[PDB]
Write a protein that binds this DNA or RNA. Structure first.
Lengths: 186, 214, 167, 54, 158
RNA sequence: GUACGUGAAAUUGCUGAAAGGGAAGCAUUGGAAAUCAGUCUUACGUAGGUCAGCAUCAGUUUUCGGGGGCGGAAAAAGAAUAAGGGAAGGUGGCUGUUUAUAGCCCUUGUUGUAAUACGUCCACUGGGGACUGAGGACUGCGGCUUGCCAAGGAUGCUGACAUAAUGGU
RNA sequence: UCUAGUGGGCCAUUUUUGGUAAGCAGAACUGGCGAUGCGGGAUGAACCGAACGUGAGGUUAAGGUGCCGGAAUGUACGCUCAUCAGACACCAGAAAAGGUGUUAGUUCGAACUAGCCCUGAAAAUGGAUGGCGCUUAAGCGUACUACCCAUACCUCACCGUCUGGGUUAAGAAGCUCAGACGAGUAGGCAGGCGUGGAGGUUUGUGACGAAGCCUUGGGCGUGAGCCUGGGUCGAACAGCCUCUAGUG
RNA sequence: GCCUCGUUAGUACUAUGGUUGGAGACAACAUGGGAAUCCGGGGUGCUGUAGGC
């Protein structure tokens, strides 16, 4: 008899992608070797983000990449941008700067605009040749909580989260508990 | 080829001379206490010996029906299992910890033989959170080498004399997993040592018990 | 197996008591740990000393100077019973103070069902004069002592072939 | 049994009596209104003066 | 049961014996800043601004300062978590924690020892240590001869 | 064979075997009886089936023995041998006394750095028994004198039977 | 973040309220039982000890060592004789007051004071220190050794889980190294076994016997199961990858 | 009267522990913490700012 808090404690981690994509598994197999044969935190983080799921890999945008790489001091220069996820176009920006992005997927609009205006689009394996240790690479992430679910998570009294309502209007969770004229506001 | 053997040959003798110095220190301290006691007897006065700074605690009770405070303290002592032993630096904070869990553990003053055979026969290190036995001096050097603890004898000296790095040495040592005492306990095991039991403080009597479990 | 211990101790010095008094006790205990416990037990009831605010300044194991000489020991004890209002004086004849105390503890437990915790030894004194001596102890002191050997039940040796002589 | 508090402290400590997370900045809102107003103006000038110095 | 604000407050909000009358004015002449660690001791004479009986004897950190009161933040165990309780308590029910002042005095002393150690080129161990076991020492018997004691015979004092 | 493809179980009769003193069934371990497979025979002095015995070792453990260091009142004692003291539960002597024709008790000296007991320790040592042999070229840490080694987990020398012998049902 | 079950509890320690009391009603703190086997208390849900993967060896806990029953008819000192003695906590029950019973004490022969025994003591099927029996005990009190043995401890083997470390020379979904650990109702999750039908596949099996059935034959797997020898039988059926469901 | 020190007193009480004692009430012991009244001694305001003498 031993006084141990908990036995056989796996914490939370994913060891392989739940995806059955053959090419994703090929990239994972590459970055398994790269992570464990190099001391690169970059390679380890790329391997972990390849394991991650769709909600944990939000899409990044052309303009967001341009915004992050053009931040006054920055010194982003010609350093390649790396995102483990999809790069979506932003129609609102009318001129796309010369950019270098390595990503799992580029939308057809985003890939066309990047190639038409300046730089190049790379896959994560081609990045593994140019920068096998991830040197001079700007690793970026999408906004995880821009997802609609987080607009509802944590709903409660005085939390200012969106309720799950079937329609929007004056008849739909707007009277009692939502204003002082009907009893209380909560 | 021979460059390595020469360099380690030098390192091994550094270990040997420090072990020789430590043993000389043990002998000198033992002699000094004896002579000081002899002087007190001859002159008719009384010599109060140095109170022990080192304590060995054995968990004698199992893991059932324990109050939360005693259960917390024994967890802090790393006494998770019955017949588990630990070396403790004895001070005011430790004294009132052992006071609370006195019905559940026994403790006393370890001698040189007790410390030596505990680390030799039941010596396991906490190497990358794993219970790795102390079968080579490289294991101890790879963990405690930043404190100039290079050998088993260096670890024994740090434990026995309560050196400046006693916390690191004690936490490096895995909680000793002692067997049941050969010959048994007393008739009633969960009284105090004073009232005929085997729980509580027992001073120099912890050495006979440890030699029963080794 | 009890042992006689000379236990000397004092409270730790303070501003009120820079030079505390040394108090010594002769007390019988199986080991030094119990001897120190009983010393603090007796000093605590009398003279405002804890174990915490005091210290054991000397420990000594006293052996019998004349362990091969038959002696008579008179022991005064405080006996605590279901009523607990008792003092006793008993006499035991043997060669050592330790044995007399051990025989006292066995006799006291046998006759009065008193335990080690209940009994506290007031004083153990050697009675030297025959006139100073219990009737049974005196009649052991008889110069002409002689008596037959009492019954003593005399490997496994089951199934004896002959009926025993027992004489 | 209508009421008892027997197993409740055990249930509390299984996940522990957890403490709220410590943040360096607490809301200057929800404080004194006059202090909040002036601290807005004081902060606004501070960030501008840092920007001008830079 | 009754569940009023001051239920079962007969002894805790009562003013001390021969301590009744008028509140001393050093209470009002004290200054409190946000971050100050203060003790709450509800003075029964001042009924305005009295915190609930739970907070009597509770120590917290000042978070807000007003004209006549102090905002104290206290962690209260509610089920399985500490919840932040922000009581607006009048300054009569408040006093500075001497533990904080002792800590700040110790911090000033520690910096002083560190500066003198650096100036001297020495290293000073600034951690407090628990009470160690007593050192070896001689005890003299001259004019302090031991007095042999025996347990006293039982007697009926009354 | 129409009571008709196949033809289960419950339940029934026959036969064989077995069991049984007021339930039966089950689990565990082995015996007995019946039954049966693997393995082997070969392949290349070499290696090879099953089961035993012993030796030399390793791991674990139990049980006995000897030697030595050290500690305490630097045991207490005691013996032997010099002072003095006291006496008895009074010996020779004559109930009473003081080593004589028995002796004992107390103190001191001595023999003495006495011994023993107890405690503790030896990286000092001699035996006996038990269980286990995981791993499978080489590395490592060490001792010896490069080879050797009891040093990062059993090998060596044999015998019997190759059998229902082991093993299973 | 989403969601299950739960929202009849009960017992013990200690504190405490209502009550004549209760195996009564009510709370506080903790530990348990419920949900939990094992060693022990003859037997018992909460008592004692100890909490559980499959095993070998060693050693203990609580408790025991006359025989049932593994283990000293051991050691030491007493007490007790009971005309229906006593014998181990919880616990399965008895008091005042006495007793020329007896053993020890206390204080001035007298009183007291204790320990054991007896009296007080008293039911209904025949029966309960568990039984047999036990008297310098195999009873009681104390002391000291040896011994017995739990699924607890220790060493080791194996299984699984988790954790950590390697592996571009290895169905990398693979291989390899190390350490810790293993009870479970309600309940959650994961990986597997079995059944009918559909797509693909296997030069797939089959009247030289498919499917089914019977079997004191053999073999595999922790298991769900699977394969096979022999017998019967006579027309179809299966492995693998996926799909599906009126699937155990 | 009040304030302080000692006494009370390691006393009362108390946390923990026992297959402790006792029919119980309760008690003892073990490892710890530790009062109050009576009583006796001493004491009978100290100090900050601005000033006057």
């Amino acid at each position: 008899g031993i006084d141990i808090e908990r036995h056989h404690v796996k914490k939370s981690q994913r060891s392989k992608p739940a995806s059955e994509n053959v090419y994703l598994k090929l990239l994972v197999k590459l970055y398994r070797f790269l992570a464990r044969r190099t001391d690169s935190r970059f390679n380890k983080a790329i391997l972990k983000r390849l394991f991650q799921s769709k909600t944990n890999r939000p899409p990044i945008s052309i303009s967001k990449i341009a915004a992050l790489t053009s931040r006054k001091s920055a010194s982003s220069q010609n350093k390649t941008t790396v995102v483990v996820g999809t790069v979506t176009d932003d129609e609102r920006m009318l001129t796309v700067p010369k950019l270098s992005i390595a990503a799992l997927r580029f939308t057809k609009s985003a890939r066309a605009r990047i190639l038409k205006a300046g730089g190049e689009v790379l896959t994560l394996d081609q990045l593994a040749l140019r920068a096998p240790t991830g040197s001079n690479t700007v690793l970026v992430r999408g906004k995880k909580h821009a997802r609609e679910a987080y607009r509802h998570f944590g709903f409660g009294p005085h939390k200012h989260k969106a309720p799950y309502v079937r329609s929007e209007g004056r008849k739909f969770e707007r009277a009692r508990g939502r204003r002082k004229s009907r009893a209380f506001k909560v | 080829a021979a460059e390595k053997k020469s360099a380690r040959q030098k390192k091994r003798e550094l270990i040997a001379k420090r072990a020789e110095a430590y043993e000389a220190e043990y002998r000198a301290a033992e002699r000094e206490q004896i002579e000081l006691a002899r002087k007190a007897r001859a002159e008719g006065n009384y010599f109060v010996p140095h109170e022990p700074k080192l304590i060995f605690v054995v968990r004698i009770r199992g893991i059932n029906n324990i109050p939360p405070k005693a259960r917390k303290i024994m967890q802090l002592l790393r006494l998770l299992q019955i017949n588990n032993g630990i070396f403790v630096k004895f001070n005011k904070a430790i004294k009132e910890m052992l006071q609370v869990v006195e019905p559940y553990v026994t403790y006393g003053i370890p001698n040189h033989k007790t410390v030596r055979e505990l680390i030799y026969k039941r010596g396991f290190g906490k190497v990358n959170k794993q219970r790795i036995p102390l079968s080579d001096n490289a294991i101890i050097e790879a963990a405690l080498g930043k404190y100039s603890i290079l050998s088993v004898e260096d670890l024994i000296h740090e434990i026995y004399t309560v050196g400046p790095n006693f916390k690191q040495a004690a936490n490096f040592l895995w909680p000793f997993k002692l067997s049941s005492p050969l010959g048994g306990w007393r008739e009633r095991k969960f009284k105090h040592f004073i009232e005929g039991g085997d729980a509580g403080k027992r001073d120099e009597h912890i050495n006979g018990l440890v030699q029963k479990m080794l | 197996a009890l042992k006689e211990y000379q236990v000397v101790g004092r409270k730790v010095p303070t501003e009120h008591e820079p030079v505390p008094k040394l108090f010594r006790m002769r007390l019988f205990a199986p080991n030094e740990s119990v001897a120190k416990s009983r010393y603090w037990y007796f000093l605590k009831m009398i003279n405002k000393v804890k174990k915490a605010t005091g210290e054991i300044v000397a420990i000594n194991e006293i052996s019998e100077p004349k362990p091969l000489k038959a002696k008579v020991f008179g022991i005064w004890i405080r006996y605590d019973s279901r009523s607990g209002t008792h003092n006793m004086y008993k006499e035991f004849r043997d060669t050592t103070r330790v044995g007399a105390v051990e025989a006292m503890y066995a006799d006291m437990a046998a006759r009065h069902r008193a335990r080690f915790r209940s009994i506290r030894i007031l004083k153990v004194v050697e009675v030297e004069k025959k006139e100073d001596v219990r009737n049974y102890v005196k009649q052991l002191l008889n110069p002409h002592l002689k008596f037959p050997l009492p019954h003593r039940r005399t490997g496994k040796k089951v199934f004896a072939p002959h009926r025993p002589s027992t004489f | 049994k209508n009421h008892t508090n027997h197993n409740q402290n055990k249930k509390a400590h299984r996940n522990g009596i957890k403490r709220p997370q410590k943040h360096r900045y607490d809301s200057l809102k929800y404080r004194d209104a006059k202090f909040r107003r002036n601290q807005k103006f004081a902060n606004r000038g501070t960030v501008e003066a840092i920007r001008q110095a830079k | 049961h009754s569940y009023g604000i001051r239920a079962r407050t007969r002894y805790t909000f009562q003013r001390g014996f021969r301590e009744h009358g008028q509140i001393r004015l050093s209470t009002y002449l004290k200054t409190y800043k946000v971050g100050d660690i203060v003790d709450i001791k509800v003075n029964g004479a001042v009924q305005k601004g009295m915190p609930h009986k739970y907070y009597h004897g509770k120590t917290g950190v000042v978070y807000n300062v007003t004209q006549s009161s102090v905002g104290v933040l206290i962690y209260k165990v509610v089920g399985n978590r500490y919840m932040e309780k922000r009581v607006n308590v009048r300054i009569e029910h408040v006093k500075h924690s001497k533990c904080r002042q002792d800590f700040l005095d110790r911090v000033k002393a520690n910096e002083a020892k560190r500066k003198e150690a650096k100036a001297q080129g020495k290293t000073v161990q600034l951690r407090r240590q628990p009470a160690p076991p007593a050192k070896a020492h001689f005890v003299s018997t001259e004019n302090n001869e031991p007095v042999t004691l025996h347990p006293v015979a039982y007697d009926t004092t009354i």
